[PDB]
Structure formats: structure tokens, C-alpha cells
Amino acid sequence: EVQLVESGGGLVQPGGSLRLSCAASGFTFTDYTMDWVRYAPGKGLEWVADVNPNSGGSIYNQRFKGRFTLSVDRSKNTLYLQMNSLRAEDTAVYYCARNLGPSFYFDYWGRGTLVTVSSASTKGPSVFPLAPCGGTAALGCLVKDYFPEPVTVSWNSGALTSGVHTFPAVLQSSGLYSLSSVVTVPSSSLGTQTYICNVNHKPSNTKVDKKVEP
Amino acid sequence: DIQMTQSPSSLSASVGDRVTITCKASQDVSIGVAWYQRKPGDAPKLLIYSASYRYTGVPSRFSGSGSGTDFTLTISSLQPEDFATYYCQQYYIYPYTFGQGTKVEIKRTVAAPSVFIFPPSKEQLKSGTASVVCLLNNFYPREAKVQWKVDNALQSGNSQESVTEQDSKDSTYSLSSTLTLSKADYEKHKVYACEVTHQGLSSPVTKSFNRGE
Incomplete structure (x- = not known):
């Protein structure tokens, strides 16, 4: 199974440096070219750079030349993207990708790591239950005032997935994010089954398991 | 290029x-x-x-x-x-x-939203802030309006709405509108309600609750 695991992403102040890494597994590392591609809403997709794991030779997009350095460690099956002098314009999800030969189309992509370039500080969310005072009933969780993005929400440790609606985060006036996670369940289960939402905001290491009681 | x-x-x-x-x-x-x-x-x-x-x-x-x-x-x-x-x-x-x-x-096909209302939690109220959430579940089209009322008075500038991406299975959208008030403003009123207007609904729908019930 081919997998490209990215790390080193997160919040960085403007003018700051970040080093992204991509652990490659499930294939012969030195047999394919490795790349970094970035995504930003409204801006679309942009090829950043490529490195040949066999030689160590790397080619950069003229916008990122000098500013970013792409190295590799064959013994560790990891490629590194040193990103220097980061600006707000650099805020994007950075993807690790694989290609073969002179054809730069990418068959395998990593999960993507979000890089947030901001002067603001890390703030964990406050987690509050959403419970009511027919056949179907709704219950949820309010994940309020956190920075930076993202947050993950699961219900009953990942057992409950159907009818789950985790709303996109809304940026508030304060510069802090806020979101809601809801779930539609049968009304008869409210008194016989326990509903717990599990919230994880990795930047602040806040892991909350809130029980929702009607 | x-x-x-x-x-x-x-x-x-x-x-x-x-x-x-x-x-x-x-x-x-x-x-x-x-x-x-x-x-x-x-x-x-x-x-x-x-x-x-x-x-x-x-x-x-x-x-x-x-x-x-x-x-x-x-x-x-x-x-x-x-x-x-x-x-x-x-x-x-x-x-x-x-x-x-x-x-x-x-x-x-046009699908009407199932509407739900949530009072601010007891845990939140001890923080000096109160959030009232109105949920509009699995509807089509994307266009919907959510009006807020406190003691039968129309609210302005104190609500934020969020819409989910189109569902990969039933092709429906979901919306949440969050009414944010201070604990003081919440404790001085009783009736909290959201009025929903959508193509799938013949006439607007209301969901409400009375603080302290």
C-alpha cells in the first residue's frame, strides 16, 4: 500500500521558517520523482518543486526558487521542504506527490498539511453540548473560539458516522474560528444510548470528550 | 508560463x-x-x-x-x-x-429542511456568553433564509450561518445559524426563536424555546 505521510505543518509567524517532511512507503522510493504541490481556496493548484530521490537533484518553480530548499534522506525514505521567509500569501495545504519520468502527472498524493502564516497565537476551543429542552431527534457540539485551523470531530469514538454534519469553520470578528457538529439520531435512543462528541484541535493539544444530555 | x-x-x-x-x-x-x-x-x-x-x-x-x-x-x-x-x-x-x-x-428534487433549535448550555452560561443554534437539516436547493427573534423582536448583526458541502449520497445541504448574545442579554429575555423560509416549505416554519424550561 502506497502512502505519503506529511508532517511539520502548522502556525508560523510572517517572516518565519517551516520545514515540511514527507515519509514515503509501499514502493521503491528511488524509482519515482517526488513533488510538492500546494492548494489554496480561490487560488487553485500550484506545483512547488520536485526532487529525484536517486540523485538528490531538485527543480523548483521560479516563484519558490531560493526561498524553498528540497532535500532527501534515502536511509529514512523522507524528503524535506525547507520554507523560509513565509508570508500570508504562503497560507495553503501543501501536498506531497509522486510522478514517473518526464511526465509530471501525479498518481499518488498525500493527505496534505496546512500551513498557516499569521501573527496570531494558538488558542484551544471551548466545547459545549447542543441538546434540546417526532421520530428523529438532533443533538450536537459547539466548538467555539479556536486558532489556527483545523479541528476534527467524531461521535461515540467513530462508531456513529451516518447523519453527522460537521459544519465548515466560520472566522469570527475576533480572528478566532468557531464551528458546530451535529447528528440526527432516532428519538427513542436519547434515554437508552449515551452520546459523546470527541473534539481534537492538534495545534493546542486540546482533546475533549463532551457527553450530550437532552 | x-x-x-x-x-x-x-x-x-x-x-x-x-x-x-x-x-x-x-x-x-x-x-x-x-x-x-x-x-x-x-x-x-x-x-x-x-x-x-x-x-x-x-x-x-x-x-x-x-x-x-x-x-x-x-x-x-x-x-x-x-x-x-x-x-x-x-x-x-x-x-x-x-x-x-x-x-x-x-x-x-426539492427537499424541505428539518428544523431544530438548541438553547445555550449550563456550562457555557458560566462563561458570560450564550450561543443559540438553529439547524436546517438536509434540504434542496441551497437557498434558505433564517430570521432570529428574541422576545418577539427581530435580530440583526448578531448571527452567523454556516452551510455544509453538497452531500455525496443524497445531494442535500445543511445549514446552522448561531445567535450570539452576552449572558446578561440572554438572562433578561424569555422567548428565543428562528423562522425558516425555503422553497420546499409552503409557509415559513418556526422553532422556539423559553429560557428556564
């Missing part, structure tokens, strides 16, 4: 329709064009390479055609799971540029 211009920027089509997305190159690229599918919160998936060659495991409905400067991606029979942003990419000339993308939305 070679520009890759996609047309249209967005489109809507019913399940089973033939969808046609075009890509224009600023100069000749022969058949060095790839197509990708990017679903929300997911990494782009490779669909087509060499302008017409379909990648392994890609459904038969997806097909590419064209050479030189004019390229097309076709979905023979649109499915509810095909909701995504599609990108063309020229890959034989550096810096192997991608098109802006085309957001494919699914047209479906």
Missing part, C-alpha cells in the same frame, strides 16, 4: 446527465494533459493522463479527449458522488501548470 483556462467555472446537472468541462491551453501541448478530481477536504485524484487515457480504478463514465490547445473532460452519466472540483493540468512543460478548476454541483 502556459495558462490553462477551464470553462465553465461551475455547473449544475441532474443525476444521469452528460457533463462536459473544457480546458484551453495558451500554447500547443499536444496530449500532455491530465485531469484531476478534488472532493472537499480531500487530496486531488488522478482521472485521465495523455489527454484520453483513463487511470486504473477510474469509473468508465469519466473520459478525456482533445489535442493541442483544446481539451475536454466528459462524465457520461453524472452520479451524486461526482460532486467535486475538476482540474486540467499540462505536464510536459515546466512549471506543469493546473487550470482554475470547475465546481460540479448536482441538480436534484
